[PDB]
Amino acid sequence: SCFSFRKLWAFTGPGFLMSIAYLDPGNIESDLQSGAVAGFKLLWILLLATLVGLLLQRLAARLGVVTGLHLAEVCHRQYPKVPRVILWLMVELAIIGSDMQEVIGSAIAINLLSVGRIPLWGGVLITIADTFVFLFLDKYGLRKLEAFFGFLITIMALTFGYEYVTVKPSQSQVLKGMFVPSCSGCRTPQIEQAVGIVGAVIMPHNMYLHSALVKSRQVNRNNKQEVREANKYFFIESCIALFVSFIINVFVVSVFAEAFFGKTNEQVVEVCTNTSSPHAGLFPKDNSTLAVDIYKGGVVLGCYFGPAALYIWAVGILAAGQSSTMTGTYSGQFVMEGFLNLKWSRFARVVLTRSIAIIPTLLVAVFQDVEHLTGMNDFLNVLQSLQLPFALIPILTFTSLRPVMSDFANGLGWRIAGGILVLIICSINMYFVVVYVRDLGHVALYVVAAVVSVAYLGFVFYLGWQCLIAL
Ligand SMILES: [Mn+2]
């Protein structure tokens, strides 16, 4: 048949987890910074990042279907023993960074629900209970969790939808920002946050997860018709999931763009004092523009539109953090199953990720303040943008070789588009790393920074050289 919902319902199950995977708290933070630094003018790059992320997720589905072994397994079989462990360690660092960003977001939301009675370290300690939830799930062995993901999308959609309905932003301006590429009056940190959003939307570890979830569906690899049908339907399912995630991201960008774009500190301080909520001394009184965090965004939202919008924003961040936790556990489990061949349970993986996440975050929370936590969040964002090439390259390298894919290699346009995509991404990363290095200027710590930079560039050059051999 050409297309039918009867066959569409059979292939369901990867779609919900892929949909929640694109709305971790880091994605909401990237949209949050997008909606105050630049407003609507830098919304089209969200659509571009979502479109190229799907067009990469379909390659993940193709690698999953045509050969039953998912992306971590074929990565184990293809590359040698030396770079396999290094690429695995960089993927682990990316997953740990995502889980640490989750811990920051969940700690901020736990602090913000309770009206500040719970300290930040209290929220970071309260985030440990996800591990005990995973213990109870393994013990009882539900092993389905689709209803969770559906309820998660339900609560997140109704939260940010209530935010959008309350603020009532202009659809003409948001569509103008959406479909007309134009960034007038640009400034170099504005393009820095542009690279931040394009690096944060394409999460690095989603491929491995999508390939493994596609592998979970039984399918005859030899038969061509079932292969093509399952491949195209997983592509449509990923398209629907990414469309829903893109709509929620657009809601976040539009609400923060219309509400607090360009509002100086005096206006928000006067309005929030008129509201009489106790959270007023956080913002200074000076001519500068409003700086928004996951916390400070919630405070300005509460002081503008009452406590209901604040609690809805915080519970939305909590649901997004739960999504990032579950996606991190699943992707990490398949990564350890494939790369170095350890059949670790979900509980051991969540203990590893959550412990390495909470130790620096508990230190920073119990010592330093919320502004340094958001600075660490920005550091994790630029880290995720740094880790983007290790997801862009190897999938393109593996699902184009004729021996591994049989007759389902990529066509000429797909390969050349991937070539220009890898070239623009690694050139952006090289320029951004030297931009970050030139500020440093130290006698010695400049040297170890240069050592890290040249090591990373050598590894990215090796992967790109392997890809150009493959293409
Ligand atoms: Mn992330």
Numbering used by the authors: 92 to 562
What do the paper's sentences say?
We then prepared samples of complexes of DMT1 containing either both binders (Sb1 and Sb2), or only Sb2 to record data in presence of Mn2+ by cryo-EM. Datasets of the ternary DMT1/Sb1/Sb2 complex and the binary DMT1/Sb2 complex yielded reconstructions at resolutions of 3.9 and 3.6 Å respectively, which both permitted the assignment of structural features of the transporter. Whereas both sybodies were visible in certain 2D classes, Sb2, which presumably binds to an intracellular epitope, was not defined after 3D reconstruction due to the intrinsic heterogeneity of the interaction. In both datasets, the transporter resides in a single conformation that carries features of an occluded state observed in homologs from prokaryotes and plants. Upon superposition of the membrane-spanning helices, the RMSDs of 2.3 and 2.2 Å compared to the inward-occluded and outward-facing conformations of the bacterial transporter emphasize that the observed structure of DMT1 represents an intermediate state situated in-between the two conformations of the prokaryotic homolog. Conversely, on the closed intracellular access to the binding site, we find a tighter interaction in DMT1occ where α1a, the major mobile element upon the transition into an inward-facing state, engages in tight interactions with α5 and α8, which are much less pronounced in the prokaryotic homolog. While metal ion interactions prevail in all conformations, they are supposed to be most extended in an occluded state of the transporter where the ion is largely surrounded by either protein residues or single trapped water molecules, and where the access to this site is sealed from both sides of the membrane. This state is adopted in the DMT1occ structure obtained in presence of Mn2+, where residual density at the binding site presumably corresponds to a bound transition metal ion. Besides the described close contacts, the same region also harbors residues at somewhat larger distance including Ser 189 and Gln 192, both on α3, which potentially also contribute to ion stabilization by either providing weaker direct or water-mediated interactions in a second coordination shell.
